[PDB]
């Protein structure tokens, strides 16, 4: 459990470090938000734990 949480708290930083590096682009945001799927989905542990 305490490593699934570490994985999720690491797939979030690797997302806001790209939402802020894309100072010019929109696709990498709308492609996620328009999809109701888990925006913070992290398969390598999230898809097992679930």
């Amino acid at each position: 459990f305490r490593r699934v949480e570490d994985s999720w708290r690491e797939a979030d930083r690797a997302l806001r470090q790209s939402i802020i590096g894309e100072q010019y682009h929109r696709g990498d945001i709308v492609e996620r938000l328009l999809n109701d799927q888990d925006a913070l989905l992290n398969t390598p542990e999230g898809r097992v734990f679930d």
């Binding site: 708290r9 979030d12 930083r13 806001r16 470090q17 802020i20």
Partner: protein
């Protein structure tokens, strides 16, 4: 020989100087009074090297330093400015607040009700830059300390019962195009020095 400025104007300008900024959302009876006699207020504030700045769109009045007939110098070296120069880590939170404010403004229009943000949304944003100390208590204390230091500048109220903070509209003027351009230039200079 002796003529007193209209007592209403004296009261309004004294309150305006005391708080640093005035609003129709909290003190309409004084905001209107100042907004009807801007020439009188600017001339009264002229000797102190302080000048009014008006915002009819949002309902905001504020006082700002002057430079005319005494160019250059430094805005914060002025003798009456009672608070320290802005700090980098504070300006980061200022930028985040301004981003939330532009979102809210462009959604609901300008001046419609009040802009609000929940403390929850601000902890993650800082967590990218300032680093994670692995203790929600400590980073919450850090965020609250930053917000309190910003209340000394009049950009935000303190957290209320629901852990929410109003973003005072003065922020729209503190970080606007010219100032942001200067800040970007200075930050790029610092980065170049770092290399």
């Amino acid at each position: 020989s002796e003529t007193r400025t209209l007592q209403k104007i004296r009261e309004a300008t004294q309150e305006l100087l005391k708080y640093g900024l005035l609003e129709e959302a909290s003190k309409p009876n004084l905001y209107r009074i100042v907004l009807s006699h801007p020439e009188e207020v600017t001339r009264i504030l002229e000797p102190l090297d302080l000048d009014i700045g008006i915002d009819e769109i949002r309902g905001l009045l504020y006082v700002k330093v002057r430079l005319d007939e005494t160019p250059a110098q430094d805005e914060w070296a002025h003798p009456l400015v009672r608070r320290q120069r802005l700090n980098l880590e504070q300006s980061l939170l200022v930028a985040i607040l301004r981003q939330h404010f532009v979102a809210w403004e462009q959604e609901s229009g300008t001046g419609a009700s009040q802009a609000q943000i929940a403390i929850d949304d601000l902890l993650p944003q800082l967590q990218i830059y300032l680093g994670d100390p692995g203790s929600e208590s400590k980073e919450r204390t850090r965020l609250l300390t930053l917000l309190d230091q910003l209340k000394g500048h009049g950009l935000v109220t303190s957290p209320d019962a629901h852990e929410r903070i109003v973003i005072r509209p003065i922020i729209a003027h503190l970080a606007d195009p010219i100032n942001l351009q200067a800040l970007l230039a200075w930050l790029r200079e610092q980065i170049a020095q770092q290399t």
